[PDB]
């Protein structure tokens, strides 16, 4: 493989002479871009379910660091790009759980794709695509003396993909019911939580000094 | 971890000393049973696009091995049990697809849980739990020279649990969208299909020369 990462959650991208895009850059509707890294903003609303102990809906704000392919073609219609997910930080803060930093977890490729849909009838444009990620990620918890993973990825989707990036779109986590979150030093154990639902929006490209 | 695989999609349990049960074993309600690994049929209805070719629904048929850790409790309410998927084969045949052959990828451990949910639905009463599993599998399709590969778990579920093991009950896979399946002998390429929906049902217990 061409990645290093022990497990891998979609196709690894390369990130070798490949520029990062900042603010500035103009994001152009129905226009398959050159390869770049995206720095971008984004927020979500995160759920978290404590057994026994209760349930928490944190707000988050941070960034990402996104790496896309070349598009297999310069049309839109037939365009397809591939993306990893780099590098993150996201920030919330909850009275129960203190401080939450989440990032990625360096032992897997967080990895995704944005194609054409095999559904197109949901009321997105006429054309437009669809974009998924699964991502491996870290949830530094200081107040609760815990770090926590996920083993299962979290499946983070943008529908009704117009422009790539999608800056400004909303997006969802799927997933059903819960999704465990394990102790980053006892990840074969019972999971601690469990992450219930998550919504997230992205934002536009940033310039290094807001990371 | 104490699994050796290369992919974890969860928790391992212990199968060494835990013994099968086959049909004729009751399957009583509401009743948390002894560590073992459950032989049950199932069938399922799954839909695989092929980019630029068609999209086929094929319908599958054949059992699973899943074991059980011991229950957290012996009182229903409080009751959770970890599960592994450890064998599996399920056919299924289609013209265009040929006979297609589903087992576990011998790379990822395919790891469940069943537990109260946070969200019970109306139907679903204060009592009944909720069953999940995050599958690694291998798509033998003859036909067409290949064997695909899931990178991302496919998740199955089932909800309104009221028997361990769920006997009988339908479930779902939590597919959105499109689900990329790999060729085993290029995993870091373009998908070469996508499981975009997928159905399934329990049986009941089999005998051991039904496998
Ligand atoms: C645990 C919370 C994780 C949230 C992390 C955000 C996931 C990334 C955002 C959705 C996919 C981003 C797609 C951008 C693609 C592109 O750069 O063109
Ligand atoms: C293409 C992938 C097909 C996979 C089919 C799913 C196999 C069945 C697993 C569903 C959960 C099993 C729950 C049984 C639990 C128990 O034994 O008590």
């Known amino acids: 493989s061409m990645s290093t990462k022990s497990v891998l959650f ?3 991208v390369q990130t070798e002479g490949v520029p990062n895009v900042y603010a500035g850059a103009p994001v152009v509707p129905w226009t398959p871009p050159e390869p770049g890294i995206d720095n971008l903003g984004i927020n979500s609303i995160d759920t978290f379910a404590v057994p026994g102990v209760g349930e928490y809906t944190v707000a988050f704000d941070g960034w990402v660091r996104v790496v896309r392919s070349p598009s297999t073609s310069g049309e839109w219609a037939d365009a397809e790009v591939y993306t990893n997910l780099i590098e993150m930080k996201m920030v919330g803060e909850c ?4 401080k939450i930093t989440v990032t990625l977890n360096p032992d897997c490729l967080s990895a995704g794709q944005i194609r ?3 559904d197109p009838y949901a009321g997105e444009g006429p054309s437009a695509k ?4 699964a991502v491996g990620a870290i949830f530094d918890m200081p107040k609760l003396g815990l770090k926590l993973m996920n083993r299962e990825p979290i499946i983070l989707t ?3 993909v117009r422009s790539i990036p ?4 909303p997006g969802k986590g799927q997933i059903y019911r819960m999704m465990p979150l394990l102790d980053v030093n006892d990840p074969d154990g019972q999971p601690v939580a469990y992450l ?9 490209y940033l310039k290094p ?3």
């Not at 669809?130 to 990620?133: D, F, G, I, P, V």
């Open 209 to 211: 000094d807001q990371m």
């Open 158 to 160: 943008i529908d009704d």
């Open 130 to 133: 669809a974009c998924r990620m």
């Open 95 to 98: 009275e129960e759980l203190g």
């Open 196 to 204: 219930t639902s998550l919504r997230f929006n992205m934002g536009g």
């Open 10 to 12: 979609g196709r690894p």
């Open 166 to 169: 999608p800056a400004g779109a």
């Open 116 to 118: 054409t849909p095999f």
